[PDB]
Amino acid sequence: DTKVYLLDGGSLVLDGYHVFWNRGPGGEVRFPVYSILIEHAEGRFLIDTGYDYDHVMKVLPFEKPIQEKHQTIPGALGLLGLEPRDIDVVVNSHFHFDHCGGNKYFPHAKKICHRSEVPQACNPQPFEHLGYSDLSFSAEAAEARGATAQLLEGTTRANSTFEGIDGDVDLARGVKLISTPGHSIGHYSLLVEFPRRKPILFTIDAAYTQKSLETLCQAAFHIDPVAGVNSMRKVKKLAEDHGAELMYSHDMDNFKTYRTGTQFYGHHHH
């Protein structure tokens, strides 16, 4: 019928000026990170794979990760009686480290990302190195960036090739990847339709929080802030023209009301 499970992936810390470009205010802010499991008649799709705890502790310990073992990808799938192997397709919104930390566990799945994202990861802008700091999702990108030491044993170029896409696309029936560049060169948001509840528009990094979308204030991490704003406009109109419940990527106060673990969206209405 289509169910959506949120895999709770723990949390990270940014300054308020990171979350709210120039606006802020400043001071530490902790936000959640999660992934999106779609159980669908055409297969099990995982959208993003959270952050890898060792990677963050090594490279971004100032983000002070807190992630319990049920909040790794295999752990969170564990709560559903699932293993990484049960996932048929992994989709990455973009290759910032907190959205592709768990790709390494899916050599057998088909991978999908925007055409431009793997090239970006191999060779990012000088201000993007930190965002694209976990190359374990791609043997190729790891090579180009000289970070093959991140590759999990058994990751080859063969089991980590992506099918590049472009523009708005149907992942499956009732499931659209919505093109939302700006934050990154090939950033995608997600729209999931159900049969007895209103569509869900997952903003991912096009809108970190409700506050972001409300004031058109994007995150300070972006490659193109004009594009970033247009993508917010596009996401706002999309939500309106559909019936969509907007679910945000990194919004602690909103996250508390989100279903994680064994709870899911898309229940049968008797």
Ligand X SMILES: Cc1ncc2c(c1O)COC2=O
Residues in 64-103 that interact with ligand X by CB under 6 A: 66-68, 71, 96, 98
Q: Which option in a second copy, ligand X, Zn ion, none does residue 68 bind, with CB closer than 5 to 8 A by kind?
A: ligand X
- Extract the tokens encoding 94: 């973009």
Catalytic residue ranges: 98
Residues flagged as binding site for Zn(2+):
94, 96, 98-99, 183, 205, 250
Q: How far is the CB of 43 from a second copy (least distance, A)?
A: 9
Query: Which of 106, 43, 99, 100 is CA-nearest to residue 74?
Result: 106
In the list 57, 130, 152, 216, the residue contacting ligand X (rule: CB under 6 A) is: 130
In the list 2, 32, 37, 162, the residue contacting ligand X (rule: CB under 6 A) is: 32
Give alpha helix (H) positions in 61-160.
73-78, 117-122, 139-144
Q: Please give the C-alpha separations between residue 168 and each of 88, 141, 165, 181, 257, in angstroms, as whole numbers.
A: 21, 25, 9, 11, 29
Task: By CB under 8 A, name the binding residues for a second copy.
Answer: 1, 80-81, 83, 85-86, 262, 264, 268
| Binding status of residue 114 toward Zn ion by CB under 5 A | no
Query: Which of 153, 256, 250 is CA-nearest to residue 203?
Result: 250
Q: Which option in Zn ion, ligand X, a second copy, none does residue 42 bind, with CB closer than 5 to 8 A by kind?
A: none
Q: How far apart are CA 113 and CA 140, in angstroms?
A: 14
| Binding status of residue 10 toward ligand X by CB under 6 A | yes
Query: Which of 189, 183, 191, 190 is CA-nearest to residue 227?
Result: 183
Instruction: State the number of CA atoms in the 13 A half-sphere of 96 facing the CB.
Output: 21
In the list 36, 40, 45, 96, the residue contacting Zn ion (rule: CB under 5 A) is: 96
Q: How far is the CB of 38 from a second copy (least distance, A)?
A: 15
Q: In this complex, which beta carbon is closest to a second copy, that of residue 74 or of residue 225?
A: 74
**Letter string b/e over residues 37-51, b meaning 16 or more CB atoms within 10 A of that residue's CB:** bbbbeeebbbbbbbb
- Extract the tokens encoding 201: 């528009």
Binding site for ligand X (CB under 6 A): 8, 10-12, 14, 32, 66-68, 71, 96, 98, 130-131, 221, 255
Residues near Zn ion (CB under 5 A): 96, 98, 205
